[PDB]
Amino acid sequence: TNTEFESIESEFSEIEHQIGNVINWTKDSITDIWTYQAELLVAMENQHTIDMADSEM
Amino acid sequence: INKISTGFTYGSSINSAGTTRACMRNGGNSFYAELKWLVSKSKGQNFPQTTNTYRNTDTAEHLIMWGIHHPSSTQEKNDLYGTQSLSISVGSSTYRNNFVPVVGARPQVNGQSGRIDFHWTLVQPGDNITFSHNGGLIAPSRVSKLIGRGLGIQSDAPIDNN
Amino acid sequence: RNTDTAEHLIMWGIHHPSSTQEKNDLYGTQSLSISVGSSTYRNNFVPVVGARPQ
Numbered sequence: 001t002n003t004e005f006e007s008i009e010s011e012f013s014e015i016e017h018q019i020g021n022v023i024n025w026t027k028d029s030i031t032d033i034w035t036y037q038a039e040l041l042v043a044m045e046n047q048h049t050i051d052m053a054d055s056e057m
Numbered sequence: 058i059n060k061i062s063t064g065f066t067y068g069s070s071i072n073s074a075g076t077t078r079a080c081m082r083n084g085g086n087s088f089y090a091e092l093k094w095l096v097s098k099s100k101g102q103n104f105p106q107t108t109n110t111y112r113n114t115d116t117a118e119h120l121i122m123w124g125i126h127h128p129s130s131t132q133e134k135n136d137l138y139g140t141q142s143l144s145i146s147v148g149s150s151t152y153r154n155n156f157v158p159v160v161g162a163r164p165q166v167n168g169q170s171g172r173i174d175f176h177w178t179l180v181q182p183g184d185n186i187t188f189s190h191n192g193g194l195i196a197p198s199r200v201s202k203l204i205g206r207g208l209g210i211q212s213d214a215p216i217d218n219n
Numbered sequence: 220r221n222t223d224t225a226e227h228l229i230m231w232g233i234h235h236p237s238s239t240q241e242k243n244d245l246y247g248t249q250s251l252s253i254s255v256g257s258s259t260y261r262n263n264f265v266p267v268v269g270a271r272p273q
């Protein structure tokens with residue numbers, strides 16, 4: 001899925017304090033979603049591989 | 058980015074001879090490449106009121122940018138612009154604002170003691186903008202124009218062309 | 220004054236004359252000003268004239 005992203009955070013930053021906090025909150029929430037989503041996905045797929053291979057035998 | 062010339066012209070009492078030591082070109086005497094720091098011709102005479110307008114005949118939107126100058130002492134402003142109460146206004150068919158110079162004691166910085174703040178607005182095809190001012194206007198002489206799309210990257214590392 | 224049991228919403232506006240020949244006839248020759256103050260809100264505005272488009 002070739003969605004292309006662009007910067008929203010200035011590394012050489014001089015930002016405000018409210019909108020900065022709003023942007024900070026969503027990034028961690030989505031980051032936790034990806035971390036929680038990814039960890040269960042891999043651990044979930046490993047279960048099938050072990051189970052499937054044992055069945056073919 | 059592309060460009061188109063303003064076409065602006067100014068009277069005999071207006072000039073662009075102001076120079077600042079803080080910018081580096083051929084010994085220091087210079088100013089930005091595409092903005093004009095207007096000041097009075099004679100010493101002790103006021104800045105005349107002038108109206109200026111710009112037309113857009115291109116098939117695409119533009120981006121006009123200008124600035125206003127803040128002196129740092131009462132002894133400074135009267136020499137440059139005059140003794141009257143300065144004021145400038147900008148109005149397009151989609152924009153409207155007003156600004157006023159103000160002076161006061163301030164710190165020292167690498168270039169002189171003073172400040173200038175820039176402003177900008179978008180202009181549509183077949184649309185005009187007008188500038189009314191009698192001092193303090195850092196009037197542009199060439200305007201910018203943006204086309205296409207790119208990708209901004211902000212880092213610090215050697216480049217590789219292979 | 221509000222005597223109802225619910226909040227309201229009040230709107231107003233300010234006039235920007237487009238030439239000095241306008242304001243001196245409509246409003247006068249003094250420096251116009253306006254201030255608005257509630258128990259929760261406080262602001263101030265000023266008319267300003269200047270050449271503009273059509």
Ligand SMILES: *[C@@H]1O[C@H](CO)[C@@H](O)[C@H](O)[C@H]1NC(C)=O
Binds near residue numbers: 017
């Ligand atoms: C937002 O996060 C950045 C990066 O961790 C941090 O530097 C900043 O203090 C946080 N809060 C803001 C920008 O208000």
Ligand SMILES: *[C@@H]1O[C@H](CO)[C@@H](O)[C@H](O)[C@H]1NC(C)=O
Binds near residue numbers: 150183184
């Ligand atoms: C700008 O000025 C030109 C002058 O020919 C006029 O034709 C055009 O309608 C003006 N545009 C606006 C938006 O008033």
